[PDB]
Protein backbone atom coordinates (compact mmCIF):
# COMPACT_ATOMS: atom_id res chain seq x y z
CA UNK A 1 0.00 0.00 0.00
CA UNK A 2 2.69 2.48 1.08
CA UNK A 3 5.03 1.75 -1.83
CA UNK A 4 2.15 2.08 -4.31
CA UNK A 5 1.42 5.63 -3.17
CA UNK A 6 5.16 6.20 -3.23
CA UNK A 7 4.88 5.34 -6.93
CA UNK A 8 1.71 7.43 -7.20
CA UNK A 9 3.83 10.36 -5.95
CA UNK A 10 6.68 10.09 -8.48
CA UNK A 11 4.16 10.20 -11.34
CA UNK A 12 3.34 13.65 -9.93
CA UNK A 13 7.03 14.62 -10.10
CA UNK A 14 7.07 14.62 -13.93
CA UNK A 15 3.78 16.43 -14.50
CA UNK A 16 0.05 15.84 -14.85
CA UNK A 17 0.09 13.86 -18.13
CA UNK A 18 -0.01 10.59 -16.14
CA UNK A 19 -2.05 11.75 -13.10
CA UNK A 20 -5.62 10.29 -12.95
CA UNK A 21 -4.99 7.03 -14.87
CA UNK A 22 -7.55 5.66 -17.31
CA UNK A 23 -8.30 2.28 -15.70
CA UNK A 24 -8.35 1.41 -11.99
CA UNK A 25 -11.26 3.39 -10.77
CA UNK A 26 -13.19 0.69 -12.63
CA UNK A 27 -13.18 -2.40 -10.37
CA UNK A 28 -13.50 -3.09 -6.64
CA UNK A 29 -13.44 -6.38 -4.68
CA UNK A 30 -14.09 -6.70 -0.94
CA UNK A 31 -14.62 -10.34 0.02
CA UNK A 32 -11.43 -12.22 0.99
CA UNK A 33 -8.06 -11.70 0.17
CA UNK A 34 -8.27 -10.41 -3.51
CA UNK A 35 -8.13 -6.70 -2.51
CA UNK A 36 -4.54 -7.27 -1.46
CA UNK A 37 -4.00 -8.20 -5.12
CA UNK A 38 -5.74 -4.96 -6.10
CA UNK A 39 -2.88 -3.36 -4.17
CA UNK A 40 -0.37 -5.41 -6.19
CA UNK A 41 -1.91 -4.53 -9.55
CA UNK A 42 -1.93 -0.99 -8.18
CA UNK A 43 1.73 -1.46 -7.40
CA UNK A 44 2.85 -2.36 -10.91
CA UNK A 45 0.46 -0.28 -13.07
CA UNK A 46 1.18 3.40 -12.40
CA UNK A 47 4.83 2.46 -11.81
CA UNK A 48 5.33 0.74 -15.16
CA UNK A 49 3.69 3.48 -17.28
CA UNK A 50 6.08 6.00 -15.69
CA UNK A 51 8.96 3.74 -16.79
CA UNK A 52 7.68 3.63 -20.37
CA UNK A 53 7.20 7.42 -20.43
CA UNK A 54 10.78 8.13 -19.36
CA UNK A 55 12.05 5.45 -21.76
CA UNK A 56 10.03 7.23 -24.44
CA UNK A 57 10.48 10.94 -24.04
CA UNK A 58 12.80 11.74 -21.09
CA UNK A 59 15.44 9.23 -22.33
CA UNK A 60 16.32 7.24 -19.20
CA UNK A 61 18.33 4.66 -21.16
CA UNK A 62 20.20 7.48 -22.92
CA UNK A 63 20.84 9.17 -19.56
CA UNK A 64 22.06 6.02 -17.78
CA UNK A 65 24.49 5.15 -20.59
CA UNK A 66 25.96 8.66 -20.64
CA UNK A 67 26.62 8.84 -16.88
CA UNK A 68 28.13 5.38 -17.43
CA UNK A 69 30.49 6.54 -20.18
CA UNK A 70 31.57 9.70 -18.33
CA UNK A 71 32.68 8.07 -15.05
CA UNK A 72 34.11 4.87 -16.57
CA UNK A 73 35.72 6.15 -19.84
CA UNK A 74 34.27 3.63 -22.28
CA UNK A 75 34.93 6.14 -25.08
CA UNK A 76 38.56 7.22 -24.86
CA UNK A 77 38.79 9.12 -28.15
CA UNK A 78 37.20 11.95 -26.20
CA UNK A 79 39.86 11.55 -23.51
CA UNK A 80 43.01 11.98 -25.59
CA UNK A 81 41.45 15.38 -26.18
CA UNK A 82 40.14 15.65 -22.59
CA UNK A 83 42.85 14.11 -20.38
CA UNK A 84 45.74 15.37 -22.54
CA UNK A 85 44.42 18.93 -22.27
CA UNK A 86 43.84 18.72 -18.52
CA UNK A 87 47.26 17.25 -17.60
CA UNK A 88 48.94 20.21 -19.31
CA UNK A 89 47.06 22.44 -16.84
CA UNK A 90 46.84 20.38 -13.60
CA UNK A 91 50.57 19.58 -13.32
CA UNK A 92 51.08 22.41 -10.82
CA UNK A 93 48.86 22.90 -7.74
CA UNK A 94 45.72 24.90 -8.57
CA UNK A 95 45.49 28.52 -7.44
CA UNK A 96 41.86 29.64 -7.86
CA UNK A 97 41.16 30.19 -11.57
CA UNK A 98 42.30 26.87 -13.07
CA UNK A 99 38.95 24.94 -12.97
CA UNK A 100 37.27 27.84 -14.79
CA UNK A 101 39.85 27.48 -17.57
CA UNK A 102 39.56 23.67 -17.42
CA UNK A 103 35.86 23.67 -18.32
CA UNK A 104 36.79 26.19 -21.00
CA UNK A 105 39.15 23.50 -22.32
CA UNK A 106 36.53 20.77 -21.84
CA UNK A 107 33.96 22.00 -24.36
CA UNK A 108 36.78 22.99 -26.72
CA UNK A 109 37.84 19.34 -26.88
CA UNK A 110 34.28 17.96 -26.78
CA UNK A 111 33.50 19.39 -30.22
CA UNK A 112 36.91 18.92 -31.78
CA UNK A 113 36.48 15.21 -30.99
CA UNK A 114 32.80 15.54 -32.18
CA UNK A 115 30.70 13.65 -29.64
CA UNK A 116 27.25 12.31 -30.57
CA UNK A 117 24.95 15.25 -29.78
CA UNK A 118 26.97 18.12 -28.27
CA UNK A 119 24.04 20.08 -26.68
CA UNK A 120 23.17 16.73 -25.04
CA UNK A 121 26.77 15.67 -24.29
CA UNK A 122 27.89 18.92 -22.62
CA UNK A 123 26.41 17.98 -19.22
CA UNK A 124 29.95 17.59 -17.81
CA UNK A 125 30.51 20.14 -15.04
CA UNK A 126 34.04 19.95 -13.64
CA UNK A 127 34.38 19.43 -9.89
CA UNK A 128 37.76 20.32 -8.39
CA UNK A 129 36.74 0.60 3.78
CA UNK A 130 37.21 4.28 4.68
CA UNK A 131 39.15 5.94 1.87
CA UNK A 132 40.56 9.38 1.17
CA UNK A 133 42.05 10.91 -1.96
CA UNK A 134 45.60 9.78 -2.69
CA UNK A 135 46.44 11.70 -5.87
CA UNK A 136 47.45 15.30 -6.45
CA UNK A 137 44.10 16.61 -7.73
CA UNK A 138 40.43 16.49 -6.80
CA UNK A 139 39.62 16.44 -10.52
CA UNK A 140 36.36 14.69 -11.42
CA UNK A 141 33.08 15.38 -13.21
CA UNK A 142 29.46 16.03 -12.26
CA UNK A 143 26.43 15.04 -14.33
CA UNK A 144 23.24 17.11 -14.46
CA UNK A 145 20.75 14.99 -12.49
CA UNK A 146 17.13 16.17 -12.60
CA UNK A 147 14.18 14.70 -10.70
CA UNK A 148 12.34 12.35 -11.19
CA UNK A 149 15.51 10.79 -12.62
CA UNK A 150 16.95 11.19 -9.10
CA UNK A 151 15.09 7.95 -8.25
CA UNK A 152 16.74 5.70 -10.85
CA UNK A 153 20.20 7.09 -10.08
CA UNK A 154 20.59 8.98 -6.82
CA UNK A 155 22.76 11.87 -5.70
CA UNK A 156 24.35 9.35 -3.34
CA UNK A 157 24.98 7.18 -6.41
CA UNK A 158 26.53 10.17 -8.20
CA UNK A 159 29.19 10.46 -5.50
CA UNK A 160 29.85 6.73 -5.91
CA UNK A 161 30.46 7.33 -9.62
CA UNK A 162 32.51 10.42 -8.72
CA UNK A 163 34.91 8.35 -6.60
CA UNK A 164 34.87 5.76 -9.41
CA UNK A 165 36.18 8.19 -12.04
CA UNK A 166 38.90 9.40 -9.65
CA UNK A 167 40.47 5.95 -9.27
CA UNK A 168 40.38 5.45 -13.04
CA UNK A 169 42.05 8.79 -13.78
CA UNK A 170 44.95 8.20 -11.35
CA UNK A 171 46.41 5.23 -13.23
CA UNK A 172 45.41 6.85 -16.54
CA UNK A 173 47.72 9.77 -15.75
CA UNK A 174 50.57 7.28 -15.25
CA UNK A 175 50.15 6.06 -18.85
CA UNK A 176 50.05 9.66 -20.06
CA UNK A 177 53.31 10.14 -18.17
CA UNK A 178 54.56 6.81 -19.52
CA UNK A 179 53.78 7.77 -23.12
CA UNK A 180 55.84 10.89 -22.41
CA UNK A 181 58.73 8.64 -21.35
CA UNK A 182 58.54 6.89 -24.73
CA UNK A 183 58.52 10.17 -26.68
CA UNK A 184 61.36 11.73 -24.64
CA UNK A 185 63.59 8.66 -24.96
CA UNK A 186 63.20 8.86 -28.75
CA UNK A 187 66.29 10.59 -30.14
CA UNK A 188 70.92 8.96 -21.35
CA UNK A 189 74.55 9.12 -20.20
CA UNK A 190 75.96 5.58 -20.25
CA UNK A 191 72.95 3.32 -19.51
CA UNK A 192 70.94 3.45 -22.73
CA UNK A 193 70.22 -0.28 -23.13
CA UNK A 194 69.34 -0.67 -19.45
CA UNK A 195 66.85 2.19 -19.77
CA UNK A 196 65.22 0.58 -22.83
CA UNK A 197 64.31 -2.60 -20.93
CA UNK A 198 62.67 -0.85 -17.97
CA UNK A 199 60.69 1.47 -20.25
CA UNK A 200 59.19 -1.59 -21.92
CA UNK A 201 58.72 -3.46 -18.63
CA UNK A 202 56.95 -0.64 -16.78
CA UNK A 203 54.73 0.51 -19.67
CA UNK A 204 53.57 -2.99 -20.66
CA UNK A 205 52.58 -3.84 -17.07
CA UNK A 206 50.39 -0.75 -16.76
CA UNK A 207 49.01 -1.19 -20.31
CA UNK A 208 48.00 -4.71 -19.27
CA UNK A 209 46.38 -3.79 -15.94
CA UNK A 210 44.47 -0.76 -17.20
CA UNK A 211 43.21 -2.49 -20.31
CA UNK A 212 41.88 -5.01 -17.79
CA UNK A 213 40.49 -2.73 -15.06
CA UNK A 214 38.47 -0.84 -17.65
CA UNK A 215 37.20 -4.04 -19.22
CA UNK A 216 36.12 -6.13 -16.23
CA UNK A 217 33.74 -3.30 -15.44
CA UNK A 218 32.43 -3.55 -19.03
CA UNK A 219 31.61 -7.24 -19.44
CA UNK A 220 29.21 -7.07 -16.45
CA UNK A 221 28.00 -3.71 -17.79
CA UNK A 222 26.46 -5.30 -20.88
CA UNK A 223 25.43 -8.23 -18.65
CA UNK A 224 23.33 -6.04 -16.37
CA UNK A 225 21.69 -3.92 -19.07
CA UNK A 226 20.42 -7.07 -20.78
CA UNK A 227 18.87 -8.22 -17.49
CA UNK A 228 17.67 -4.66 -16.88
CA UNK A 229 15.50 -4.91 -20.00
CA UNK A 230 14.46 -8.55 -19.52
CA UNK A 231 12.78 -8.63 -16.07
CA UNK A 232 11.14 -5.20 -15.74
CA UNK A 233 7.60 -5.29 -14.33
CA UNK A 234 7.67 -3.10 -11.21
CA UNK A 235 10.31 -0.47 -10.54
CA UNK A 236 11.36 -1.78 -7.11
CA UNK A 237 13.18 -5.00 -8.05
CA UNK A 238 14.56 -3.32 -11.21
CA UNK A 239 16.15 -0.57 -9.17
CA UNK A 240 17.56 -3.13 -6.73
CA UNK A 241 19.23 -5.24 -9.41
CA UNK A 242 20.33 -2.01 -11.07
CA UNK A 243 22.14 -1.33 -7.78
CA UNK A 244 23.63 -4.79 -8.28
CA UNK A 245 25.48 -3.13 -11.15
CA UNK A 246 26.63 -0.63 -8.52
CA UNK A 247 27.61 -3.67 -6.44
CA UNK A 248 29.52 -4.82 -9.53
CA UNK A 249 31.31 -1.46 -9.58
CA UNK A 250 32.01 -2.23 -5.92
CA UNK A 251 33.63 -5.56 -6.74
CA UNK A 252 35.95 -4.09 -9.39
CA UNK A 253 37.49 -1.33 -7.28
CA UNK A 254 36.77 -1.75 -3.54
CA UNK A 255 38.79 -4.99 -3.48
CA UNK A 256 41.93 -2.84 -3.52
CA UNK A 257 42.83 -1.77 0.02
CA UNK A 258 44.69 1.36 1.24
CA UNK A 259 47.96 -0.61 1.24
CA UNK A 260 47.49 -1.36 -2.48
CA UNK A 261 46.97 2.34 -3.25
CA UNK A 262 50.35 3.10 -1.69
CA UNK A 263 51.95 0.50 -3.98
CA UNK A 264 50.31 1.81 -7.16
CA UNK A 265 51.28 5.38 -6.26
CA UNK A 266 54.92 4.26 -6.06
CA UNK A 267 54.60 3.69 -9.81
CA UNK A 268 53.80 7.39 -10.29
CA UNK A 269 56.73 8.65 -8.21
CA UNK A 270 59.28 6.51 -10.08
CA UNK A 271 58.04 7.68 -13.50
CA UNK A 272 58.62 11.38 -12.75
CA UNK A 273 62.14 10.59 -11.51
CA UNK A 274 62.99 8.58 -14.63
CA UNK A 275 61.61 11.25 -16.97
CA UNK A 276 63.82 13.77 -15.17
CA UNK A 277 66.73 11.36 -15.72
CA UNK A 278 66.46 11.44 -19.52
CA UNK A 279 66.22 15.22 -19.94
CA UNK A 280 69.07 15.94 -17.51
CA UNK A 281 71.68 14.33 -19.78
CA UNK A 282 73.40 4.01 -13.92
CA UNK A 283 73.07 4.01 -10.13
CA UNK A 284 69.63 5.60 -10.46
CA UNK A 285 68.81 2.98 -13.11
CA UNK A 286 69.67 0.21 -10.65
CA UNK A 287 67.59 2.06 -8.05
CA UNK A 288 64.61 2.06 -10.42
CA UNK A 289 64.94 -1.68 -11.11
CA UNK A 290 65.04 -2.35 -7.37
CA UNK A 291 61.97 -0.12 -7.05
CA UNK A 292 60.26 -2.31 -9.66
CA UNK A 293 61.17 -5.60 -7.98
CA UNK A 294 59.85 -4.20 -4.70
CA UNK A 295 56.55 -3.57 -6.50
CA UNK A 296 56.67 -7.07 -8.00
CA UNK A 297 57.18 -8.54 -4.52
CA UNK A 298 54.36 -6.35 -3.19
CA UNK A 299 52.09 -7.70 -5.93
CA UNK A 300 52.92 -11.21 -4.72
CA UNK A 301 51.94 -10.10 -1.20
CA UNK A 302 48.52 -8.98 -2.46
CA UNK A 303 48.24 -12.35 -4.22
CA UNK A 304 48.54 -14.05 -0.83
CA UNK A 305 46.13 -11.55 0.75
CA UNK A 306 43.51 -12.23 -1.92
CA UNK A 307 43.93 -16.00 -1.47
CA UNK A 308 43.17 -15.70 2.26
CA UNK A 309 39.92 -13.77 1.76
CA UNK A 310 36.29 -14.77 2.48
CA UNK A 311 36.37 -17.48 -0.28
CA UNK A 312 33.29 -16.23 -2.15
CA UNK A 313 32.64 -15.77 -5.87
CA UNK A 314 34.29 -12.33 -5.73
CA UNK A 315 37.35 -13.97 -4.16
CA UNK A 316 37.63 -16.36 -7.11
CA UNK A 317 37.50 -13.53 -9.68
CA UNK A 318 40.15 -11.41 -7.97
CA UNK A 319 42.43 -14.39 -7.30
CA UNK A 320 42.19 -15.55 -10.92
CA UNK A 321 43.10 -12.16 -12.38
CA UNK A 322 46.12 -11.75 -10.08
CA UNK A 323 47.41 -15.23 -10.82
CA UNK A 324 46.86 -14.00 -14.38
CA UNK A 325 49.02 -10.92 -13.80
CA UNK A 326 51.59 -13.18 -12.13
CA UNK A 327 51.76 -15.34 -15.25
CA UNK A 328 52.79 -12.12 -16.97
Amino acid sequence: ILSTGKYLNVVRECGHDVTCPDAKEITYTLKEQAYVERIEKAYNYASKVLLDFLMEEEELVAHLRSIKHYFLMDQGDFFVHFMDLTEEELKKPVDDIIPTRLEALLELALRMSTANTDPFKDDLKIELTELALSGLESFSFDYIVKWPLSLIINRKALTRYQMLFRHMFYCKHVERLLCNVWISNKTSAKWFAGAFTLRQRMLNFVQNIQYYMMFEVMEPTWHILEKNLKSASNIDDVLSHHTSFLDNCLKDCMLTNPELLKIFSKLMSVCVMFTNCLQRFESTINNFDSNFSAHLMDLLDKLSMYSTSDCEHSMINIIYRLDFNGFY
Binding site: S307, I319, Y320, D323
Partner: protein, 60 residues
Amino acid sequence: LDVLNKNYNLLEHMQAMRRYLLLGQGDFIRHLMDLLKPELVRPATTLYQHNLTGILETAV
Protein backbone atom coordinates in the same frame (compact mmCIF):
# COMPACT_ATOMS: atom_id res chain seq x y z
CA LEU B 1 5.33 -32.45 -10.77
CA ASP B 2 4.47 -30.17 -13.70
CA VAL B 3 6.00 -26.97 -12.31
CA LEU B 4 9.45 -28.60 -12.17
CA ASN B 5 9.05 -29.67 -15.81
CA LYS B 6 8.27 -26.11 -16.90
CA ASN B 7 10.94 -24.32 -14.88
CA TYR B 8 13.50 -26.44 -13.04
CA ASN B 9 13.84 -29.93 -14.65
CA LEU B 10 14.06 -31.76 -11.32
CA LEU B 11 14.09 -35.41 -12.40
CA GLU B 12 16.19 -34.46 -15.42
CA HIS B 13 18.87 -33.61 -12.86
CA MET B 14 18.37 -37.11 -11.44
CA GLN B 15 19.54 -38.56 -14.76
CA ALA B 16 22.15 -35.80 -15.05
CA MET B 17 24.11 -36.56 -11.87
CA ARG B 18 24.51 -40.20 -12.97
CA ARG B 19 26.70 -39.00 -15.86
CA TYR B 20 29.21 -37.28 -13.54
CA LEU B 21 29.29 -38.76 -10.03
CA LEU B 22 28.11 -42.21 -11.17
CA LEU B 23 29.99 -41.88 -14.51
CA GLY B 24 27.23 -42.92 -16.90
CA GLN B 25 28.73 -41.58 -20.13
CA GLY B 26 32.47 -42.19 -20.18
CA ASP B 27 33.50 -39.65 -22.83
CA PHE B 28 32.80 -36.81 -20.39
CA ILE B 29 35.17 -38.42 -17.88
CA ARG B 30 37.81 -39.96 -20.17
CA HIS B 31 38.57 -36.66 -21.91
CA LEU B 32 38.57 -35.29 -18.37
CA MET B 33 40.92 -37.94 -16.91
CA ASP B 34 43.31 -37.73 -19.88
CA LEU B 35 43.79 -33.98 -19.31
CA LEU B 36 43.68 -34.38 -15.54
CA LYS B 37 46.66 -36.74 -15.13
CA PRO B 38 49.51 -34.18 -15.78
CA GLU B 39 48.18 -32.27 -12.74
CA LEU B 40 47.46 -35.24 -10.45
CA VAL B 41 50.99 -36.69 -10.68
CA ARG B 42 52.41 -33.72 -8.75
CA PRO B 43 51.43 -32.97 -5.13
CA ALA B 44 48.66 -30.42 -4.68
CA THR B 45 49.43 -26.80 -3.79
CA THR B 46 47.66 -23.49 -3.17
CA LEU B 47 47.70 -22.88 -6.94
CA TYR B 48 45.98 -26.22 -7.62
CA GLN B 49 42.39 -24.94 -7.96
CA HIS B 50 42.63 -22.19 -10.60
CA ASN B 51 43.96 -24.56 -13.27
CA LEU B 52 41.43 -27.29 -12.45
CA THR B 53 38.50 -25.01 -13.26
CA GLY B 54 40.15 -24.27 -16.60
CA ILE B 55 40.86 -27.93 -17.28
CA LEU B 56 37.23 -28.73 -16.43
CA GLU B 57 35.88 -26.08 -18.79
CA THR B 58 38.04 -27.05 -21.78
CA ALA B 59 37.14 -30.71 -21.20
CA VAL B 60 33.38 -30.05 -21.48
